[PDB]
Amino acid sequence: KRIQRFDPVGVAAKDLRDCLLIQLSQFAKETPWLEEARLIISDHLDLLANHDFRTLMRVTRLKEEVLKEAVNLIQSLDPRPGQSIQTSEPEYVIPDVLVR
Amino acid sequence: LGQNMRVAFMPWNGYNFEDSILVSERVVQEDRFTTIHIQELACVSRDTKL
């Protein structure tokens, strides 16, 4: 938790969507649709993973076409934020007949 | 090549110790002798193996 209490959001996630949960927790409660976003992230993770928006609305009892905003808020939570640190890979291509 | 600025000959208050020039706020105001520059940069596309 202390490591997760460090940059970036979701450090040592292990379990998936821990970056999303950490970003949502870091996000202030003043943001709207945050409760439904957290509900989708915590336990409707499969519901959104299956893109089961109708099933998400039916199970989470979230408002129709309004839970979409919560799902978007959950989506904007830096998934694989740790992959952001890795940005440089060496270039390697062998032209064995180089038409130019 | 350059600005024709008014000056007067006298030392004063140590601010002109050996080889100093005392430009007051005036030449700041009309900002004569403001410098111009244009500098460039670029990037490449480089269709890669990855």
Q: Which residues of B touch A (CB under 8 A)?
A: 46, 48-50
Phi-psi region of B14 (alpha: psi -120 to 50; beta: other; left: phi over 0): left
CA distance B10 to B21: 11
Partner B, chain A 81-100, Cβ-Cβ below 8 Å: 89, 91-93
Are A78 and A84 in contact by the 8 Å Cβ rule? The answer is yes
Resolution value (Å, 1 decimal): 6.6
CA distance A48 to A36: 12
Interchain CB distance below 8 Å, A89 and B49: no
SS (H, E, C) A26-83: HCCCCCCCHHHHHHHHHCCHHHHHCCCHHHHHHHHCCCCCCHHHHHHHHHCCCCCCHH
Experimental technique of record: cryo-EM
Q: In Å, how far are A12, A64, A82 from A19, measured between CA atoms?
A: 9, 26, 9
Exposure of A86 in the CB half-sphere (CA atoms within 13 A): 6
Cα dihedral value B28, B33, B34, B38, nearest 10: -170
CA distance B39 to chain A (A): 27
How many Cβ atoms from other residues are within 10 Å of residue A85's Cβ? 8
Would you call B39 exposed, middle or buried from its count of C-beta atoms within 10 A (0-12, 13-18, 19+)? exposed
Interchain CB distance below 8 Å, B49 and A91: yes
* Cβ pairs bridging A and B (under 8 Å): 8
Task: Name the residue among A2, A47, A50, A36 with its Cα closest to residue A22.
Answer: A2
Q: What is the token pair recorded at A67? A: 């839970």
DSSP-based three-state secondary structure for B42: coil
